[PDB]
Symmetry: C3
Subunit: 570 residues, 3 copies
Amino acid sequence: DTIDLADGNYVVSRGDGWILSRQNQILGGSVISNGSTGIVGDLRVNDNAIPYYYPTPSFNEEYIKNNIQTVFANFTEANQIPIGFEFSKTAPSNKNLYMYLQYTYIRYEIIKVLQHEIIERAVLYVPSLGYVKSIEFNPGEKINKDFYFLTNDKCILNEQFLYKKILRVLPYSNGLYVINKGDGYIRTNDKDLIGTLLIEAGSSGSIIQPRLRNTTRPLFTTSNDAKFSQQYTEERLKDAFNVQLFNTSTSLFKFVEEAPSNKNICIKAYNTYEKYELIDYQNGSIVNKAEYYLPSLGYCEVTNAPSPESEVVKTQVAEDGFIQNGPEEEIVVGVIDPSENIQEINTAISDNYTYNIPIVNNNPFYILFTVNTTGIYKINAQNNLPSLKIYEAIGSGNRNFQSGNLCDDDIKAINYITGFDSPNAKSYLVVLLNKDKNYYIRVPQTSSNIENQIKFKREEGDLRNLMNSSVNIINLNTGAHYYTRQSPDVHDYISYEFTIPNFNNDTSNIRLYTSYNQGIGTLFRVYNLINIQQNLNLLNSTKSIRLLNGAIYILKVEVTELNNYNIKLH
Amino acid sequence: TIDLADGNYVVSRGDGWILSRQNQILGGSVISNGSTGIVGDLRVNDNAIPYYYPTPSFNEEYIKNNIQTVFANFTEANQIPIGFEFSKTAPSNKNLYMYLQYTYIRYEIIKVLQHEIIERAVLYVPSLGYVKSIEFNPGEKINKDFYFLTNDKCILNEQFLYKKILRVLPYSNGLYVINKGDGYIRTNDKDLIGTLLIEAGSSGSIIQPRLRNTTRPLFTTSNDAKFSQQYTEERLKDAFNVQLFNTSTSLFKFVEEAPSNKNICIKAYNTYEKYELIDYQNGSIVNKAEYYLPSLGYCEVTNAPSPESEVVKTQVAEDGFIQNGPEEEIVVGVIDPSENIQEINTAISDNYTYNIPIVNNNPFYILFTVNTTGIYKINAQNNLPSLKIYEAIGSGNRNFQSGNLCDDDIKAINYITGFDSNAKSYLVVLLNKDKNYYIRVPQTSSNIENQIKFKREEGDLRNLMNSSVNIINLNHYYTRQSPDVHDYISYEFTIPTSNIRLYTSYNQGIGTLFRVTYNLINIQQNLNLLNSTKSIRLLNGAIYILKVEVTELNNYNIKLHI
Amino acid sequence: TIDLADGNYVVSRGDGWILSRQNQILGGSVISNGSTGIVGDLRVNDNAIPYYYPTPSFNEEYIKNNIQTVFANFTEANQIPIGFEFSKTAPSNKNLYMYLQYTYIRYEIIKVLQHEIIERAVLYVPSLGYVKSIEFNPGEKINKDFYFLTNDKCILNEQFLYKKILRVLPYSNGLYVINKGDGYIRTNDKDLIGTLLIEAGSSGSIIQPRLRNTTRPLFTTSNDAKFSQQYTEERLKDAFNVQLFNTSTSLFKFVEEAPSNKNICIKAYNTYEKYELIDYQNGSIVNKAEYYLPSLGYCEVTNAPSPESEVVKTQVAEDGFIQNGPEEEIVVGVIDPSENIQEINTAISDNYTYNIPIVNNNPFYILFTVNTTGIYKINAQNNLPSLKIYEAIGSGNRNFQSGNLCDDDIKAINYITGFDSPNAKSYLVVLLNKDKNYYIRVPQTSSNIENQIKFKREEGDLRNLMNSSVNIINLNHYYTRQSPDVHDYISYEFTIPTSNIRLYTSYNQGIGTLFRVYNLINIQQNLNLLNSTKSILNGAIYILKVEVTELNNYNIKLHID
């Protein structure tokens, strides 16, 4: 009756597996014989889900319930979903087996501490699951009264004492992402525990989640409710992974464990969530974040049942948080910004198209289009001034198809290919585009009212060497120069175009290297392209190359070691 | 890229299609240390909504109507709840993760021009699910392809089914209901519940719970005026006591456990029990109605081939049925519902004389029973109306009153003996005590008072048991309906000393010629009469009886010569 | 053919009857290559309606009433959904076909005249089903007997059950609820759910889901004025906290897999848990109410006999109960609901003095608790009202407040010591636990003078008399009191009028002690007192502690000479 806690009020959880005195046999028992299998079960809903309160003058029913639901699992919300448990036992040949069902409870206590003693204690019994006790008997056998009758409340498991006092370089493009961070997420302090089943040796026990009530309780958290609301997050989840049902589920999950004939074991079942993150990656940093926990199909932990008589170590409840019991996962799916216009090119591009920029008024927007046949396309704008960025709709072309026309599959899940989200950067994209697939070109937010054009042209030449890379157009006076762009991910490409400052057939001393990033560069001179070198590593290279004056050269760089968000070139 | 002629086609790419990006949106289970994880779902409301991808050459109506004309009608099938389950066990001290998906049947509407697909419409009908499992460790880096699918694929092997868009019965006259077997299905997967791909070391089950009891029987007839659907159901009730046609309460379920070295697939179908109602008249079938009562399903279990094999473009089979159950043919004669059933309430003891009432020339039945088991000779006045005796199948197993007929209202009858004819005959038959028997009086052509007589045979006439005796002119060939094999037919004639040769045609029968002295004495034994050339000395002006046991039945009719 | 006397009889031909021509009208399943086929059904609504075949002397009402009077009441039974299941596996590279049937219980109403059955009525009550399986090949010719049944038959062995149609309890006085065991059934198959015939190598299951939660308890009493059904249910709630009568949520299911060598039959029953409410007074049972709370079922597994053996005509057994569960007897005393419960809110520390009020002369309880564990001597003025201490079973396991009584409303009590015999001088020496709640039943007094209950903590030599009641004794000799149970204690206090004193008892075996008087000093030890002839100051107080070892009589008698 002595504690080490400071003076005050505490919320105490004595754990699951509590059975109550004298209510041992009041649910009924089964008799089986000669190899028969006896299965006894129940469903926890309505009357058998009502907690039993034992209030005290200082701690009333509301004072108990509110504190218990604030720190531990919310039983009021949990008791509205029917949960089933089953126990299976087989009788040996030429023998009689008797088994009777009980109910197990989670014992919560509200205690008052004064001068290192418990002067007051409240009790709450929340129904969780059941317990089957079996025996083998013979006619006229005298069974011990302890098998039938319980005098005082006991924990079939080992009791616990949980108290609380009452008072990475991402090489992403700018835009939205939905990340599947894994499955099997649970909450601390047994906030998701369905229940514990103690299975005796040689018997079977199952915890069943039928869909008697097709209802779930998703958990949501955001850093900016103005932009990333719950409805906004659900719409983006539907855009990314086509999630339809959030607060309703029809899937059934069930865990069954058979105990070995030599030891007793217990199983714990939990409710799981599938973690989703909606981020707004801008200029190399996360600006917005919203965590969405879609309810998953449960997690079962199977452990050997410890001795009911064991040392009780009084423990403080862990801080509120999540634990992942499923495997590691990170699926990144870019989604279309819902606050931007989607323009379309209905007739598929064959060899030459010249899109006219409309109704947009300098706002950034998408251009949904497709090509007539697979090939390498150079996509540029007037004087290359607005730097475009090409995307691909994930899973486009697998369905309805019409030859020579765009089929708007209405897929907002996009995959970045190449392009810079930089103002005032001359560039054109050299990309390989597939037939019948839908592609997006995000035109950046311009500041000019002059009519602009997007041009598409098939590369039936040496320019196919620059496939899936964006070429920077360069300014030069010799001396020291630096150019900073977003570093492409590992194994991706970035191209540079520059001229040596009078064409005479006159060389120059030109040094080529990068900063903080390793890439096996390649050099082409011009339009026909011929290779000058193969394996220029440009991390901090001091190499020098004879460069003809007044000639155009191209620097393809394949990023191998991504150390910085930005790539710098000299 | 196609071999089909120019036009529009309906294409089925088969079941087992999974859609991109929606792999993990239903949830996943984590299990550890010997636990069993079971994950399932039920397809009824939102799990059964097809997804249409129309083109500006076809339509959602154009897709649905063409799909449902040739392949399974999903609209009427998606309204019946179907359950599927997947079971997996984790090994000791190890963590197992599994996540549920949905499988679809990919239907396509394609347009062909100059041997190429210029337009393609897509329909995804939901069928079943698919559970994908892995074993992981804390900090294990799992391949993204396990979690995420980029493009739609078939977990099974894809298919390409296209269609261009533009015996001697020795029966008596009367009605029959024939159970022709169970496990009947329809071609082109018109009854396929779904396919489950079970990975090695896991279990998968397809469940048909009776959440909705509606069933859809199929019926076809050759004469809707006579053999309507309601008429066929009434005759089925008469024959086999079938009560529930559109409703079923029985639950069926197929479970298969995959071996640890093979991943295998199971196909579940809806089955029908074939019934035929026929009107056999004068040796030929005049009417026929086919009724397919919905049965309790059929499961086909086969090893799953590689999802990547040669796709051979195939034409859909013609409309029809396949029997996957065992061979069956149960023939149960039924009482004609368009004929009167008269009754003899007091059981026949030794002598009865029924008076024909009212029934003036329509055929009718006489339901009756005997006081004790014995051989009864049943005739009519001058034997002119040839009667036919039947037996009610399963009469006397129930309510009983001594010395009185107890009506059982059993319309299932079993033919014993008698002719469908204007032919002098009397029946010698053994009748059981409590059983109910029918005597079909034929359609007469006179207004005179006729009588049916029953007399117990305690003499030598008991040798002709379960046979009808023809009374014989002869001052020669006689044609009657041939009794079935091992059955009997009797002939009675008078000799006008002489040379007598008796033989049959197209049928082999064991003659057992007796002489009438009324007393019967056996004169010749085992006279095989199939084109026999034997002869017997026959006394002039004496009555003789020839019992014939049909051994070889080649013709509907039995012929006999003098 | 009959041996019965002339008259009318009710006949049960048992379960397992299948009807002619209705064989594969429910459908059949085809499985192949290691598949498992499971076929089941649920007995309710239409497949639950009996089929009557009346006779001129026995109509439908006559048949139904006579069947339900003697055998199982099917009308009440058919309203509760019961499920059955059959499981079969097909071997590799083979085709298995199975079709479902319905089984019935054949009841007959027969009339006997001159040793013969002149009239017979038939009733077919629905029960569970029957699955028949076969292994077939393409083009295999199957026997018509497998598909088609011509006449009704019993898949089990038929039966012919006919009926002609025309101990020292050492308890204290008070109420008890006794759990007499589980698995109780009724004779003549009045609780039989049904029988499943499982073919070799297949599985069969009888399922009791809760689609209807209604259950049907059976109740019998000897005095409906006092022990009504509601009174019995309230006492069951007091004793074992039984909350749901005539309603259950628990699901029970029996599954049996038949060996590949034998056919197996399983019988499922509805079970009851027997409860007895008794009024034990002055050594005899005065009232008794028997309550049979419906339990989870009982399954009997036996090898299927040949459906063809001698059908020995049998008379139905007398109505009664059979226990198929283990032996049990749990005795729980309950608080008398017709008596007042007073309370002492402040826990007793060392000294309390309750003043007896509202109670008049009626007997009543005093609910109280002590501050700390110790041996308390509880008396009442001049020891005239003999008190009896009880303990509330399961008190102190829950809400707690230091220094105050926490009422738990537990009416389940455990007798400790005290005499239910007024006009007897006594005080109780008992050890009381700290947080436990205790009852003191004050007997029905006859005086109007205010009396008092005194509690005093014993820190002296009086602790030797723990858990015993001391009789205060005339003696200028035999004394009769209720004999304590075996291993319990009873104490006697007397004054000597030195002298020769003989100590012995009658009909009871007891180890005695002779503590001399306040300080107590041991004088005699291990005095075996049944008819003992042993013998031993003058004008001194002695105490006789007696430990009952052999209980032959309800009363203990002690002689002093």
